[PDB]
Every structure is written in structure tokens, then in C-alpha cells.
Amino acid sequence: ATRLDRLVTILETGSTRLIRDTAVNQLADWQKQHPEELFNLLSRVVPYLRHKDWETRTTAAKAIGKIIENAPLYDPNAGRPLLREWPFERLCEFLKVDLFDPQWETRHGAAMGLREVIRVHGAGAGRRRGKTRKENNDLNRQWLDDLAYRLLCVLMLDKFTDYSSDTSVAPIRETVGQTLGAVLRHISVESVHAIYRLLYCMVGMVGLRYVVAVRKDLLLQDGDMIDGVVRCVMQGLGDIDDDVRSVSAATLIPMAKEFVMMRRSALDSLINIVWESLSNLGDDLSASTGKIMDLLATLCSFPEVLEAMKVSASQDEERSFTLLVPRLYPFLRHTITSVRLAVLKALMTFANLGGETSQGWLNGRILRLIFQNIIVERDQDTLNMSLELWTTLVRRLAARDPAILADEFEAHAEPMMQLALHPIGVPRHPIPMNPALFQKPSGGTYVDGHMIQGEVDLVGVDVLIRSRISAAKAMGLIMSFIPTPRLASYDTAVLQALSSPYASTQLAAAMVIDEYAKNCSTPEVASRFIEPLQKIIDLERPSHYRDLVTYVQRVRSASQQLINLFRDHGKVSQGKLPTLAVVVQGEPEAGPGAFSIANAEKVVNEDFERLKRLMAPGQRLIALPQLNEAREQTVEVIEEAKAAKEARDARIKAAAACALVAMKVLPKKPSPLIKAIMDSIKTEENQELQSRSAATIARLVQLFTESGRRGPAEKVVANLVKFSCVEVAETPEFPIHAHKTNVILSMQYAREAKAARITRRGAKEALEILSKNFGAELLERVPTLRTFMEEPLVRAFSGDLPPEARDPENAFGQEIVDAMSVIRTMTPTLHPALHPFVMQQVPLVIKALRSDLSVFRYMAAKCMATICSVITVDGMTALVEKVLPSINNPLDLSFRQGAIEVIYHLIAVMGDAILPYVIFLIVPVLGRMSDSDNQIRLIATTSFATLVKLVPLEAGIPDPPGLSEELLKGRDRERTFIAQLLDPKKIEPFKIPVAIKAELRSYQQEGVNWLAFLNKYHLHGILCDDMGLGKTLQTICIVASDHHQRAEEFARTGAPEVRKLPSLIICPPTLSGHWQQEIKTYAPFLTVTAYVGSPAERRAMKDSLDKTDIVITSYDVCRNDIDVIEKYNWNYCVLDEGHLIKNPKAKITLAVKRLTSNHRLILTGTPIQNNVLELWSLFDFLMPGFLGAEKVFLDRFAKPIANSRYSKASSKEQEAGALAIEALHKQVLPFLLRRLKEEVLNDLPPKILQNYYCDLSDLQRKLFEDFTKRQHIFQALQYMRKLCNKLGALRDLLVDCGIGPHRALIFCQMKEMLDMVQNTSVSYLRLDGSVEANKRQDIVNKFNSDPSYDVLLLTTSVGGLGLNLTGADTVIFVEHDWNPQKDLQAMDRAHRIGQKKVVNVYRIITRGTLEEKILSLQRFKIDVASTVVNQQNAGLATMDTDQILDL
DNA sequence: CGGCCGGGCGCCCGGCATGGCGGCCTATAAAAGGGC
DNA sequence: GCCCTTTTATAGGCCGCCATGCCGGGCGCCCGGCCG
């Protein structure tokens, strides 16, 4: 596949918007470089316009526009409703012909595409070559008129609308309007007249939005064509329907500037109609008022509109701002959020007008209404806008005079203070505010019922608390602005609140004090609130709060149940205990003897013991278990009440401490202040108060640093660093993972999970604000953080390793990870001045990534990912120069593991930013997908799933500006590296030109070329050539070349990448003598070891395995000794006859697949013999996971292959098998190199095949017919095989073959037929395996030399490779095996390179019996095997390799 | 005493096609309104 | 039976897969011997 096919698919399958933006940019640049092939891109991007996904259609339209923008401009001269040559002529016609399609997606795409095409190329449309210039201009006018006509017809017929949101959306209308706006830029003014007449000024409006706003400067002041549109818009504004009003308002707002400039006269009528339409209180569910107010704000922003409005109030004040803008006040509490937000934004625009008009309507009314908005709001955005408007209004009102602010809000201050300092209840027992405190927009006393009532169950407690803090900020600001002598009521209100029986009111009072302190000119002003706050934090807290009366009453009910019901059950007489106090503590008019938690403790312990002692004997035994249950329940309720009291006390203390630190108090004895603040950093579920406490600590540290005292400062910094590391998911508990080694951590009570993460959230926010405060100087001001971060990093350097570092009970094993978490936690928020510090520490983090400690590698991967995210160029230089080189180390498993986990986390954190470095990252992941370690393979697969999608973009990403010279050189060399993989072009093969090195034939040259290609990119294969082509030479050549290259590189480097690792070869016993001879005669500079030996002898060379370059071992010697052989690693691992390991269940496969090797190769001649699962078993050894698990491969390939055995060209079965073989062929294409003996050898005569058919004998026929009436299924097959036994055919064939000058081999699968002596001159030998193996060589060598022997009989399965029987020129088969490859091997005897004459093969196939099925199965297996290996060569192999590694 | 011995048997080969564990997947349960 | 919404959640059956074979045929290993 080309680059374009993968580049276009990103527009639909792109993971993020930036990836698709880069895809369209790359595609546009592609068209720029290759301007001759616009249609190739267009034909592939256009079909997305009718896709169902919205984003795909938008991206396809943008891609079409940017592709077309680079082509040259063209200048060849010098009422059915819609419900759910010119170079681009056919494209535009295809868009217009489905612009009336029923499906709305097609219309949306068509409109977008037409817009994009015409936007850049509208001028040259419609013209035809050969016509004159002027007539072509007329044709262009006709074309644009036709397009405008068709688009306007589309606009007036489409009714598709979306009502999901309040503001209805018409996608087709909007796109068609933008298409008109694109069209109308190029036409002449006559066509503009025609279109304006067509879209007559009546009420289309969305059509008007782009019929104007194009050719704007010429339409201005153009008589009727600009005078009628204002009438149309004004009529629309006054219309009844909300939809047309909203559309007209949205149509006028972008054109408001030039519609204002059109006339000064029209402004009076326009603003009159706008204010009149807004004056009428619209329907409750209408979002139109937002558009109307946006229009009002935009119109009032222009100076001439302000002049007109000032002129309008000529005879009276009716049209002045002061009387009008209160018309906006009713909509402040409208149900739809958009209307409320619009009201606030319009009021802010009006407030920021200036011009001495704002003083009119600014008064206490709007301030009180905005304060009510703050109190009763639930939406975050509207609350923020309300507080912003409040601040701007207060600042504007204080600009005139602080006294004006102080006495304007004096009328309203006390009720708003009651609202701000109001308590909060519990879910089912609210504490409602008085509705008389709220004013109406046009009334003295009051949709917001839930917030007023204080119903915490219906509106969450977070919303109530947020309203309280917002009110506190507003009231603190307004206190700060107004003069001090006027603050008597304010200060006494908050002082009385600080002593209230409630808990919430005290919190609100502290918040108001804190905000007043913050907003003051200097902190000393607010010093009158000092000692009440110190009384809050120092003096003991109240024993109760009115908010917890529900808890105490629950305790009272449970205690009463315990006292009463279970003693009635227990039969204890009256007078058992005095009755509990009826009134609970904390309630109003509760006496000093009111029920309290202390009474609950007394009854549940002392009275419980007393009553137990008072119970009669025997009845106590009956009663006690229910008494125990009731007692435990009572204790639980008491604990709940006490916990609630503790939480309220802690919150009040935290707020008081925040107030004290805010006014710059630094007590000489800071014992309780820091305690309260840190308690509110630990156990604060409310995010807002936690952030406030975080800011409090960040300011406290700075104040103490300026004071010079540092004890508590360092203590709190240490405590913050401690709390930042409490979350398990961000820093694990070392005592658990101390026992895990060489495992990827990334692949591996409910109450506490929340506490840990909230504490870590608070600490992290505190640390971030601290860093932002200190700026550049943080590394100078505070050194305790430095020690926490750094002391285990400079420790453990130079290979240092305390033995206690591995001790689960040593705290330093946890302190190491606690230290290393802070780098990730803090580096992104540090100043750039500290980037050199982290850069200087990167050499420590990289070594932590190479360290053999698993948690070291985990934390180093995380920290390197972060550092490369934020300190991009330096961190990535370190990564590419000193991590990725280590990814290939065979022995250092830690190096590879850490260096792959770093890539995992780097991708996960950087996301889209990793585009320029995928060229560095791709090759390591490709290599490690097939690594020996299981978890490295898994995470490499996950990383590759992300990198492959971005690989097509890497060829054109703009270089980052700051890349070091090393990174530019790295990018260049990696480009040249990948170019050979992703291009069919290839290089001269890899060879070492040693003087004694042997000569290579052409096919061997191609084979070593293929092996070197595999070697470079760390891919594995099968050299499945036919026997007799010399695979040993190629194998030892590539192994020696690799060993020579590594050894030479080890002299030019010091890294542990090269270690002179051994190489293992597993052969059958008979071929070791060939392997050693070939290695010695072709690679003298290689050393050889032969582990194959007696069971005891192997210990004499056990340690010699790790000391010799090439090690040779047998399959069975490896099997019996795998438990010791698995403990070594090898550079190469070669299986000489890999068809031994085809059955996955066989123990030889289980043994061989445990051989951890860097490179891995199978030599064979029949990778697939009976079933594709043989190929799966081989590739499970070569590239684990490449073809999936067992079930996946079975379902994908094997079942269709089996089902295709019986088919008659039917689409039900033939198609499935064909697709299965095609997929398996494409998947395994680059990793098999089959070359036929016919292609290589120049001297090997042809082989001919003929079948011999004969009918079954009479006696055998009768016996079979009898047997049909007559266990296991296979015994019938065996019996049929036996009774099928030809001798006349064999006799006639032998006589025809000159026997009894001509020779033959006779193969029989059945031994009992091979010894038959029927037909009573012919001398024959027998080789049936039962003969001793040594005697076989003598027999065959006797047969081979002299011509006195005419025939030689043998069974098919006798002898392995090398059983050369060359004298024969005919081969006769009498019974055929289930395996066709065994018959082919039997034919290969007497067809070797030493063969001299033509070889003819004959088969005796008796008709109407099992043998026909045998041959049918054989040809089926032959076809299935051959079709999978049909086309194998380096150049012929498809270079889409990256797209295959997806299981 | 050293060295080649036979010698046994565990391992793998291959067929068809049956029976016994599988994982996984709705379905299980509750209220209720509407219409078919 | 059919559908919509919602929080809760886990264990039976149904369709598959999957190792079962068992007669000759062979290879390779170690495990017993002895021979001049």
C-alpha cells in the first residue's frame, strides 16, 4: 500500500484532532509536491463527505479545501421538501446531484464540499476551453447563478432541525448559507441584484446572514438593497415565534457594525424595536432573549449608537439608560442558563461603558439583586460571571466616591449579611432562609426555592458551600472598599456570627473576615479581627453545635431503645434508670441538663454494667445477646455524632487559621495554627476549602522565609512532601513489591482509597502554588525539599546498593520511592530557571532506569516521561542518546525492561506531542514485540498500536526549533534506516570479506541478503528452502558476520550491548558432523562446542556453554536437559529441522520454546505439512503472539481450512478457505524464503509422475462388501488399508522397467506387504529399519555402486536426511501415506544433486477404496501448503511489514 | 579397565469423531406509564 | 412479547472446543550388560 492510503484513513480514525490536522496538512503538501495527481487524493477523500460521523465530514471538507488550494487557478483564455473544461466539474456535479438526497448527512457533506471548492476557485467556474473570454465570463455568471439558485431552493425546502439544546440548530441551513456566502464573493453586482430580489425582504434570515456579509463594502448605501434588509430584520425582531427572533438576532449581531454605519437614522428605530422586544417578558423556555441581549450589548458598544441613545432622551428620560436597563433585571433569574449568563454579560458591557451614563442605573438595587444571584445560583459559569459583575460594579461605584458606595449599599447591607452568614442544615432537616430577605426585580419582597429552603438533599452540599464562599468573597470586597467608620454593623454582625450556636455560620464569618483581609490595601487595617480568631483557634471549641442536634437526637433515640425495649424483653422492673432528658443539647431553650453525647457514653458503659448486674440470674442469659447488639449499635451512633462534631470543629479552625495567616499574623509559638491548616489539607473532602488551605500554606511558607525563622517552615515542607506520596496509585507501598523482580509493574479498605487521593490532591495543589509563588528562587529559598528529592539519588550512585534497600522492614526502601515521586509531582510546575537542575539530575534518573531494581525502573520511567514532556529537547536527547541504544542488550533484561516502560509512559503522557520522535521510537518497539520476555512483548505491542498509526505522518513533521545537532543527526540516520524497510529498494547484502571466507552463489547471495534484512530490524523467519541448496553456508555466514560485527563494535564502545554471547544450534544427531565441518572449513575464526554426549559426560562441558561462540546440541539432548539449558541466553538460536516442533503439545516444543535468544531462525523444507497449526506452532517459537493465541488462530484460519476440504466452488465454503489462505499468506510472507531446487541447480534432470489404476481383486472385493456389514473408526481405515493389497500391476510395471540397464526403488507404507514374495533373475535388498543402523550404510553403499542389483525395497519412514539412493531412475509407490511430504521426501531419494538420469515416479492406485481418499487428501494438503508459500524472495516480498504486527 | 555393546521403551506419528468439561452470555429481578 | 429509564450484580445452560484414543512404524535416549 502507498503512503496516501494510510494518510487518508487518519481523517476518520485519527486519535486526536491534532493528528487529523497534521494528516490534512501532509496531504496538502503532497498535492503541492505532486501537482499532477489531484484526482487521486480527491477520489479517496470525497467518499467521507457522506459518512455518518460529523467530525469525519468536517475533516474531509477541510482536507478537500486545503488540497484544492494548492492547484493552479483556472483561466483557459488570454417543491418537494428536504427531510431526513472546468477541472472539478464532475466533483461539483456529484455534490449537487446528492445535495437533494433524502439523508441529511449527504446534504451536509455536499454543502461543506461545495463551500470549500468555491471558496478558493469560484472565479474560474463554468468556463469551457475553446470559447472566447467574454462568452466564458457569461458562462461563469450562469454557473454561479445556477449554484446560488439551487442553494437558495435548498434553503427554502429544508426543515431538518435539532432540538437537543434550547437553541435549535439547522445544520443544512447553516451549511447552505455558508455556501451562498462563498458563492457571492465572485459574482458581478447584477447577479447580486438578482439574488436580493429572489430572497425578497420579508419574514430566509439565515440566507440573509450570508447574502449580506459578502460584497459588504459595495452593498453599503446601495439604495433599496440595503434599505430593505433593515426592515426585514426589524420585522423579524418583532415576530411572535422565538425561533425567528433568535435567528434574526444572531444574523444582525455580526453585521451590526456596518448596519450601524449604514445610517444614523436607522439606529433610533432599531434600538427602539430591540428594547421593546426585550421589555416583553418572553416565554419561560425561550433562549432567544440571550441572542437579543447579545445584540443589545454589541449595538451599545459602538460610539455612534451611544451618541444616538444619549440624543434619544431629548424630551424625557424614558429612553435613557437609567429607566431602560432595569428591563434586563427580570431575566436575571430566568430558567434557561443562557439567558442568565447573557444578562450578566450585557450588564458588564454596560457597566464598562463609562461616558458618565453608568452612574444613572448603578445603585443599591442592582447590587442587592446580584448578591441574591450569588447566594442562590447553582451553575458554575453563571456564578463566576455574577461575581465578576459584582466586582466591576463595586469598583465603578467606588471610583466616584467611597462614601457613595458606603451609603448606597447601607440600606441593603444587613439582610445580605444575614444571607451570607446563614447556616446549612442536614439532608432531611433543612434550615430555610426567610423569603422576605429577597427582593423581586420589580417588587419589595420575594424557581430558586430549593436553594432558599436549604434542601441539601435536593441540591448538593457542595453547591451550598460554594454559594457561601462566593457570598463571603463579595461581602469581604464590599467591606474592604467602604470606609472604616461605616463598618460598625458589618463588624458586629460577623463578631456575633463567630459566637453563634451554629457551625456553618462561624465558617462563613471566618471566610468573610479572610476575604476582607485579602482585599484590603494593607493587612494592618483588618487587625481588629485578630483576637476573636485567636480565641477560635486557641480556646477550646464548644461542646455542641445546632447543626448536630439531629445526630444527638438519633443517639437519644438509640439509647432510649436500649434502655426501654430490651429491658422490657429482659424483665427488669420499673425504676431501672431515670428517663433520658427529653430536650437534646444544641436546641433552642435547651436547659443545662439537656441530653448530650456524654450521657450516651454513661448509659452505654456504666448504666449498662449496672443494669446487667441488676438482671435476675437466668433471665440475663436469655436477654444478653440482644443487649450486646443494641449496645454496639448505640456505640456506632455515638461514634458517628462525635466524628461529625470533629469535622465541624476542624473546618471552623481551618477557616480561622486561614483568616489569621491572611492578615499576616506570624505567632511566636505556632503550635495550633499549622495543625489546623494541615488537618484541612489532609481530611478536607470539599475541594474549594482544600484549595484555600493550600494557598494558606503557600503564603505561610513565604512569610516565614521572609521572617528568617525556618524550623516550622522546614517541618511543614517535610510534611507536605510526606502527604504528596500517600496515594498508592502514584507511589506504591514498597513492603509489598520488595519481593518482585523482573516484572513489569505497569501490567499488574475501599474507604481509605478516597482518603489517600484527597490528601494527595491537597498536597499537590499546595506544592504547585508554592512553586508558582517562589518562581526562580525556589531552589535557593527552601533546601529541605532538595534533600527529600535528592538524598536517595546521590546515594546509590556508582553502583551503590545498601543491602537494607532490599529489606521489607527497612523504611528507606519506601523512602526511596517517596523521594522519587516528588520529581514527577513538581517538575511540570517549576520555573524554567530550575530546568537546568532537573537536566543535571537526568543522569541520575536514567541510571535509575537502567538499574536492576524494578521500582527504580518504574519511577525512572515515570520521571523520564514527565521530564521529556516538559524539558522536551534535553530529555529527548538523553532518551535517544543513552536509553534507546540499550534496548537491544540480550543479557541485561533490566535495561530492556526499563527502556520499554519509559517508552510506554512517554507515549501515554506526551500524547500528540510525540509526533517528531516516533521515528526514534518505532524501531525499538518493532524489535521488542518479538522479544523473549513476555511482559516486554505485551507492552511493546500496546506501544506499537499507537506508534504505527502515526508512522505515516513522520516524513513531514516540522522540526522542533531547538533540536541539538545530535538530534538532527539522529533523525537523519533513522530516516535512512527506516527508508529501506518501508521501500522495496534494498542494499547489497551483508558480508564480512575475510580472506578464507568461501564464495557465495547467486541464490545464496540473495538468501544472506534476506537474512541481513531480518537482522537489521530484529525480525525472524524460516529459511524453508528445498533440501540440497546449502542452508548451512548461509546460516553460518550470517552468524559469523553478526559475531564479527558485534566484536568489532565492542572495541569502539564500552556499553554492555556486546558481550560475545554464545549461539546455539539444535540439529538432529546425524547432521552435527556436517555442521561442524562446514563451520570449520568456512569460518575458521569461529569456535565450536558439541554439548551432545553421554548423560554424564555433559558436566565436563556444562560451563563451556557460556564460553564458545557456536554450541551444537540435539533435540532430545536439549529435551532431557532443558531444565538446565534454559538458564543461558544466546545471540542466535537455530533449529536445523524445525518440522520436529510442529505439534504444540509435544514436549520438544515446550522445551525449545523456553530458549531465550536475541535472534531466532528455523531451517526447514516443509513448514506446513498437514495443517496450518504446524505453521502456527513454528511461528509461536519464532515470534510469540504474532499469529495470536491458539483459539484466535483456530477461528481465523484453521477451521475454514478444514471446512474447505469438501467444496464445489460454492461461496459458502470455497470463499472462506480462499480468504483464509490469502490472509495467512500475506501475514507470513516476509518471514519465509522458499526457493525451489529447479530454480537453482543447473544439473538435475526433470521428474515425471504417472498414476497406475487397477480394479480391486474379486476376493478382496467380496471381503470388503462383507466387511461393510461389520470398535473404533481408525480400525476400519486400517482394515481397508490391509485388504486393499496390486501384485500383477507391480509385475507388469517391473517388466516394463527392464527389471529381470534399469533400476527402481519400491516404497510400501505397510511392512507386511513389503516382505511379500509373490510371482515366485531379480536381485533385491531390503532396508526396513529393523536392520541395525550401521548395516544400513553398508547396504545402501553396496547398492549405489555396482549395477548387479536391480531393485531395492524399503519403508517410507526409514532413515533421516542423507540416505542417498542415487542409482535409481524409477521410484514405485505401492501404498501412500497420510502425509504428502513423507512421500515427497521418499521421492527426493534418488533425486538429489548427484542424480544423473531422468527419474520417473509411478503409483499403484487401486480404484474404489481408501487410496483414492488418501490421494485426494494429499493433493488438498499440497495445495494448502503451496498456496501459502507461492511467492518468496526479498524484492518480491511485500514491504508493508509494520501493518502486520497486530495479531 | 576401557570400550563397544545390544536392549528396552518413551516419544511422536496419523486418522476420524465422540463425549465432558468449559468460558461467556443473556436472562434474571423490581417498579410504571403508554400502545401494539 | 415489546419498549424506555434507573442502581444493583452474579450464576446457571447453551454453544462450542479439545484432548481422547490406538494399531503398526520409526528414531533416540539411557539402561542394563559383556568382550579381548
For residue A580, give the H/E element and its range. none
A709-730 burial string, b = 16+ CB within 10 Å, else e?
ebeebbebbebbbebbbbbeeb
CA distance A825 to A725: 9
Helix residue ranges, H only, A280-379: 288-301, 303-312, 321-324, 337-351, 358-361, 364-376
Give CA torsion, residues A46, A52, A58, A63, to 10 deg: -30
Sign of CA dihedral A819, A939, A926, A871: negative
Question: Phi/psi of residue A1005, each to 5°?
Answer: -60, -45
| Sheet of A1021-1023, strands arranged across | A1021-1023, A1157-1163, A1130-1135, A1063-1067, A1110-1114, A1088-1090
Question: Which residues face A82 on adjacent strands?
Answer: A158
A1361 touches A1385 (CB < 8 A)? no
Residue A1364, marked binder: yes
* Residues near A1438 by beta carbon (within 8 Å), at least 6 away in sequence: A1226, A1229, A1230
CA distance A344 to A734: 54
CA distance A257 to A278: 21
Q: Shortest CA distance to A903 belongs to which of A929, A891, A892, A889?
A: A929
Kindly state the cell numbers that stand for A115: 463551500
Q: Shortest CA distance to A180 belongs to which of A218, A200, A141, A206?
A: A206
Q: Angle A1011-A1014-A1018 (CA atoms, 0-180°, nearest 5)? A: 140
User: DSSP of A71-103, one letter per residue?
Assistant: SPPP-------B----TTHHHHHHHHHSTT-SS
For residue A1195, say whether its CB is under 7 Å from any atom of strand C.
yes
Kindly state the cell numbers that stand for A43: 477520489
CA distance A925 to A931: 10
3-state secondary structure A425-481: CCCCCCCCCCHHHCCECCECCCCCHHHHHCCCCCCCHHHHHHHHHHHHHHHHHHHHH
What's domain A687-982's architecture? 3-Layer(aba) Sandwich (3.40)
A319 touches A309 (CB < 8 A)? yes
DSSP secondary structure code for residue A633 in this structure: H
User: CB neighbours (10 Å) of residue A438?
Assistant: 21
DSSP secondary structure code for residue A1106 in this structure: G
**Helix, strand, coil % (nearest 5) of chain A?**
65, 5, 30
Q: Shortest CA distance to A242 belongs to which of A289, A203, A274, A279?
A: A289
A262 touches A299 (CB < 8 A)? no
Query: 3-class SS at A1182?
Result: helix
For residue A640, give the H/E element and its range. helix A619-662
Kindly state the cell numbers that stand for A698: 503557600
Residue A1137, marked binder: yes
CA distance A573 to A632: 23
User: CB neighbours (10 Å) of residue A236?
Assistant: 24
For residue A1359, say whether its CB is under 7 Å from any atom of strand C.
yes
CA distance A797 to A809: 22
Query: 3-class SS at A1247?
Result: strand
CA distance A1062 to A1042: 12
CA distance A1215 to A792: 64
A278 touches A318 (CB < 8 A)? no
Q: Shortest CA distance to A693 belongs to which of A420, A526, A510, A524?
A: A510
For residue A1169, say whether its CB is under 7 Å from any atom of strand B.
yes
Q: Which of residues 1384-1423 of A touch strand B (CB under 7 A)?
A: 1417
CA distance A416 to A471: 9
Q: CA–C1' span, A551 to B33, in Å? A: 40
Does domain A1002-1228 sit in CATH 3.40.50.300? yes
User: CB neighbours (10 Å) of residue A1?
Assistant: 9
Query: 3-class SS at A483?
Result: coil
Question: Which residues face A1112 on adjacent strands?
Answer: A1065, A1090
Burial of A117 (0-12, 13-18, 19+ CB in 10 A): buried
For residue A81, give the H/E element and its range. none
CA distance A108 to A91: 15
Q: CA–C1' span, A1096 to C36, in Å? A: 26
Nucleotides of B under 7 A from a protein CB: 6, 11-17
3-state secondary structure A1414-1443: HHHHHHHHHHHHHHHCCCCCCCCCCCCHHH
For residue A1291, say whether its CB is under 7 Å from any atom of strand C.
no
Query: Which residue shows C-alpha cell 515366485?
Result: A1320
CA distance A355 to A1417: 99
Q: Shortest CA distance to A286 belongs to which of A314, A223, A244?
A: A244
Query: 3-class SS at A1032?
Result: helix
Which residue is nearest nucleotide C27, judged by alpha carbon to C1' distance? A1359
CA distance A608 to A180: 88
Q: CA–C1' span, A1171 to C19, in Å? A: 17
For residue A1324, give the H/E element and its range. strand A1324-1327
Query: 3-class SS at A1158?
Result: strand
**Measuring from the CA of residue A1357 to each C1', which nucleotide is nearest?**
C26
Q: Shortest CA distance to A831 belongs to which of A765, A768, A761, A910?
A: A768
CA distance A1041 to A1056: 19
- For A355: left if phi > 0, alpha if psi spans -120 to 50, otherwise beta; the answer is left
Helix residue ranges, H only, A740-885: 750-774, 778-781, 784-794, 812-826, 835-850, 854-870, 872-882
Kindly state the cell numbers that stand for A376: 442562590
The Cα diameter of chain A in Å comes to: 145
Which residue is nearest nucleotide C19, judged by alpha carbon to C1' distance? A1145
Amino acid (1-letter code) at residue A558: A
Amino acid (1-letter code) at residue A1093: G
Rg (C-alpha) for chain A, rounded Å, is 45
Q: Shortest CA distance to A854 belongs to which of A725, A732, A730?
A: A732
Q: Which residues does chain A break after (C to N > 2.5 Å)? A: 78, 84, 203, 446, 748, 1270, 1285, 1300, 1320
Sign of CA dihedral A913, A915, A921, A922: positive
* Distances A1282 to A1062, A1290, A1316, A1319 between C-alpha atoms, Å: 52, 17, 13, 19
Query: Which residue shows C-alpha cell 451570607?
Result: A420
Sign of CA dihedral A456, A461, A465, A471: negative
* Residues near A371 by beta carbon (within 8 Å), at least 6 away in sequence: A390, A412, A416, A419, A420, A471, A474, A475
For residue A1094, say whether its CB is under 7 Å from any atom of strand C.
yes
Sign of CA dihedral A753, A754, A757, A762: negative
Sign of CA dihedral A168, A171, A173, A177: positive
- For A60: left if phi > 0, alpha if psi spans -120 to 50, otherwise beta; the answer is alpha
* Residues near A119 by beta carbon (within 8 Å), at least 6 away in sequence: A65, A182
CA distance A931 to A1157: 8
Q: CA–C1' span, A1131 to B14, in Å? A: 37
* Residues near A861 by beta carbon (within 8 Å), at least 6 away in sequence: A849, A898, A901, A902, A904, A905, A906
Residue A601, marked binder: no
Query: 3-class SS at A1067?
Result: strand
Burial of A913 (0-12, 13-18, 19+ CB in 10 A): middle
DSSP secondary structure code for residue A98 in this structure: S
A265 touches A293 (CB < 8 A)? no
Determination technique used: cryo-EM
CA distance A47 to A1252: 59
Helix residue ranges, H only, A482-618: 488-497, 504-519, 530-538, 549-570, 597-602, 608-614
User: CB neighbours (10 Å) of residue A1275?
Assistant: 9
Residue A1032, marked binder: yes
CA distance A572 to A569: 8
For residue A1378, say whether its CB is under 7 Å from any atom of strand B.
yes
Query: 3-class SS at A729?
Result: coil
Sign of CA dihedral A522, A525, A529, A530: positive
User: CB neighbours (10 Å) of residue A707?
Assistant: 10
- Stated length of chain A: 1447
For residue A1194, say whether its CB is under 7 Å from any atom of strand C.
yes
Q: Which of residues 944-1003 of A touch strand B (CB under 7 A)?
A: none
CA distance A1421 to A1356: 18
* Distances A249 to A146, A215, A1445 between C-alpha atoms, Å: 29, 21, 56
Question: Phi/psi of residue A634, each to 5°?
Answer: -60, -45
Sign of CA dihedral A952, A955, A957, A963: positive
A102 touches A80 (CB < 8 A)? no
CA distance A1324 to A1350: 6
Query: 3-class SS at A1253?
Result: strand
* Residues near A768 by beta carbon (within 8 Å), at least 6 away in sequence: A826, A829
For residue A591, give the H/E element and its range. none
Q: CA–C1' span, A1340 to C33, in Å? A: 31
CA distance A1229 to A1167: 13
Question: Number of H helices and number of E strands within chain A?
Answer: 65, 12
**Measuring from the CA of residue A1121 to each C1', which nucleotide is nearest?**
C29
Q: CA–C1' span, A925 to C4, in Å? A: 48
Locate the DSSP E strands across A904-1062.
Answer: 1021-1023
Q: CA–C1' span, A1 to C4, in Å? A: 47
Question: Which residues face A927 on adjacent strands?
Answer: none
Q: Shortest CA distance to A37 belongs to which of A10, A60, A71, A65?
A: A71
CA distance A640 to A1216: 67
Amino acid (1-letter code) at residue A1300: G
Q: CA–C1' span, A1334 to B5, in Å? A: 13
A929 touches A944 (CB < 8 A)? yes
Query: Which residue shows C-alpha cell 487521593?
Result: A757
Residue A1004, marked binder: yes
